[PDB]
Amino acid sequence: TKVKYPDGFRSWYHVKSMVIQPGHPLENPFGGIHHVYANAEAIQGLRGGNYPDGAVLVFDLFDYQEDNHALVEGKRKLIGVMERDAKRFSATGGWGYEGFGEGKPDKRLVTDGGQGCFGCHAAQKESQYVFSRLRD
Amino acid sequence: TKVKYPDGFRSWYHVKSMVIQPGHPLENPFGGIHHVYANAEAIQGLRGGNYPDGAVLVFDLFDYQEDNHALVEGKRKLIGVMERDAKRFSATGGWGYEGFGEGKPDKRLVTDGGQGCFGCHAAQKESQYVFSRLRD
Numbered sequence A, B: 001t002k003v004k005y006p007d008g009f010r011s012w013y014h015v016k017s018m019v020i021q022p023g024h025p026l027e028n029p030f031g032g033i034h035h036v037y038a039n040a041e042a043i044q045g046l047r048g049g050n051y052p053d054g055a056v057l058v059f060d061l062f063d064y065q066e067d068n069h070a071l072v073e074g075k076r077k078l079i080g081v082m083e084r085d086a087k088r089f090s091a092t093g094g095w096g097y098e099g100f101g102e103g104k105p106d107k108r109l110v111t112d113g114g115q116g117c118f119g120c121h122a123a124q125k126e127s128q129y130v131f132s133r134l135r136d
């Protein structure tokens, strides 16, 4: 019913990264450097299989500072989490969506059952609602 | 005494990332988005422990493209590798240095036994020649 905080996500597989700079549509609140991490079961789905129950993807979002044309990671702003469970999260296409302020377990950001997250991720219906792709 | 290509490095622990843009003093040759990875032995060293022989750090460098206020990962330009062996790599501080063009095992880049890489990393004598720091 509630998405579990993904303890230990930092030791998971790093899928990819991207920088969202001021002026981008997603600036509020997804601006900054973000890294995507996937647990073992999520890798399964990324590689072409079905996503099994228990698959977790994390969007790890850092602020950054521009210093002499380098962008340097600052503080973590939040994580976004998608947890796969076809039964429990059926209202939102089988993924549960949560945000944790500053990456802390006690700071839950979503107040609408995850419908707002779901509304945009629904555009990737064809890829099981996941935008990120494996790269080497 | 060649550095081994670090097979499977992409499933290692992601330490940190940084973006180096035009203007920054290191644009040539390290411009792009880079990610740092570490195997289990290197984490022992990064944690404040000592570095076991067999510790490997990888600098994975990507070109990026500007897309509407986002920087998006493009193609891999190269990986830099530091491989810990106090006796084998005595001449450059106990770390062997190698570059692989586009991350390819066949594209070895280093021609001078690693002297040029070591000359800059030698600035970090007091952290055992490693610039990166663990973060959360």
Ligand code: HEC
Residues within 6 Å of the ligand: A016, A017, A018, A036, A057, A058, A059, A080, A081, A082, A097, A098, A099, A109, A110, A116, A117, A118, A120, A121, A129, A130, A131, A132, A133
């Ligand atoms: C469009 C308006 C979005 C809304 C609202 C949300 N997300 Fe999102 N998300 C979006 C894109 C374009 C991406 C890909 C970023 C990239 O580097 O390519 C993402 C990514 C995620 C991920 C990583 C997995 C993936 O689908 O690629 C997670 C775990 C994720 N998003 C979670 C999430 C949550 C919990 C949201 C509401 C708080 C949410 N997203 C909103 C686009 C959009």
Ligand code: HEC
Residues within 6 Å of the ligand: B016, B017, B018, B034, B036, B057, B058, B059, B080, B081, B082, B097, B098, B099, B110, B116, B117, B118, B120, B121, B129, B130, B131, B132, B133
């Ligand atoms: C200064 C002119 C440099 C030269 C020449 C080389 N490297 Fe380097 N390296 C440099 C910095 C400032 C950093 C840290 C980047 C960051 O995000 O903090 C690095 C990092 C590495 C790493 C990751 C481990 C670490 O020390 O932080 C590796 C594996 C590494 N560098 C390898 C490497 C090799 C193989 C080189 C010659 C081909 C080389 N470096 C040159 C600065 C400089």
Ligand SMILES: [Zn+2]
Residues within 6 Å of the ligand: A023, B069
């Ligand atoms: Zn604009």
Ligand SMILES: [Zn+2]
Residues within 6 Å of the ligand: A066, A068, A069, B021
């Ligand atoms: Zn700039």
